[PDB]
Write a protein that binds this ligand. Structure first.
Ligand SMILES: *[C@@H]1O[C@H](CO)[C@@H](O)[C@H](O)[C@H]1NC(C)=O
Ligand SMILES: *[C@@H]1O[C@H](CO)[C@@H](O)[C@H](O)[C@H]1NC(C)=O
Ligand SMILES: *[C@@H]1O[C@H](CO)[C@@H](O)[C@H](O)[C@H]1NC(C)=O
Lengths: 49, 31, 23, 49, 49
């Protein structure tokens, strides 16, 4: 019952999994955000060029 | 009884909402 | 005379639409 | 294969559930691509997928 | 490791050409701060048991 209580209120205990999920979803976002950078070009979008 | 102020270069964070209107922002160099 | 510039010094900086994102 | 004011690209187009502000043209994503345009001779707004 | 002053060193126009490369060293801090808490997490988990 104590386990059931501690899980039924607090979500901090899931940090081991949660940090992994965050680490991945953050990596995807930074990768995708790199498409917005010019890299020494006239434009960060290819199709304009 | 009018007011007046001056704009200056600032990095700002803009929160577009569901409708696409700004609702709140943060002046990045304030504190 | 002086008053406090609270938060209404803000505007859309460009003509580019965005929704539900902090940019 | 669409073209709007010089913006090329491919994909499919549909009606917009998104309400639109009467001074913009372009919906841009996080991923720096165009999801929403307006016809430059018709005030209907299209979604780009 | 600091990002900017390693690349340029307290100089303006060199740093302006850095930010057009997007967000390289932003994740490099979060990589290195990520391992920074890690040995702190290691030292915590190796003695104070
Ligand atoms: C934004 O759209 C929602 C539709 O769910 C609407 O209820 C709300 O009033 C809209 N906001 C404004 C400022 O009109
Ligand atoms: C404005 O704030 C500045 C510094 O905080 C000060 O110079 C000025 O006198 C303030 N306003 C008033 C009414 O004094
Ligand atoms: C341009 O196209 C619009 C369609 O929205 C029409 O109303 C207008 O008369 C046209 N102008 C011309 C053909 O000069």
């Amino acid at each position: 019952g104590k386990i059931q209580d501690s899980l039924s209120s607090t979500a901090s205990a899931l940090g081991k999994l949660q940090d992994v999920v965050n680490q991945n979803a953050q990596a995807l976002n930074t990768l995708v955000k790199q498409l917005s950078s010019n890299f020494g070009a006239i434009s960060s979008v290819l199709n304009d060029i | 009884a009018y007011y007046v102020g001056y704009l200056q270069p600032r990095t700002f964070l803009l929160k577009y909402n569901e409708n696409g209107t700004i609702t709140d922002a943060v002046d990045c160099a304030l504190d | 005379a002086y008053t406090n510039s609270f938060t209404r010094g803000v505007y859309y900086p460009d003509k580019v639409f965005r929704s539900s994102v902090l940019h | 294969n669409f073209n709007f004011n010089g913006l090329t690209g491919t994909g499919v187009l549909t009606e917009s559930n998104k309400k639109f502000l009467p001074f913009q043209q372009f919906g841009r994503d996080i991923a720096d691509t165009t999801d929403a345009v307006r016809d430059p001779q018709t005030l209907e707004i299209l979604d780009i997928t | 490791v600091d990002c900017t002053m390693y690349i340029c060193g307290d100089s303006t126009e060199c740093s302006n050409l850095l930010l057009q490369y997007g967000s390289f060293c932003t994740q490099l801090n979060r990589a290195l701060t990520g391992i920074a808490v890690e040995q702190d997490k290691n030292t915590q988990e190796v003695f104070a048991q």
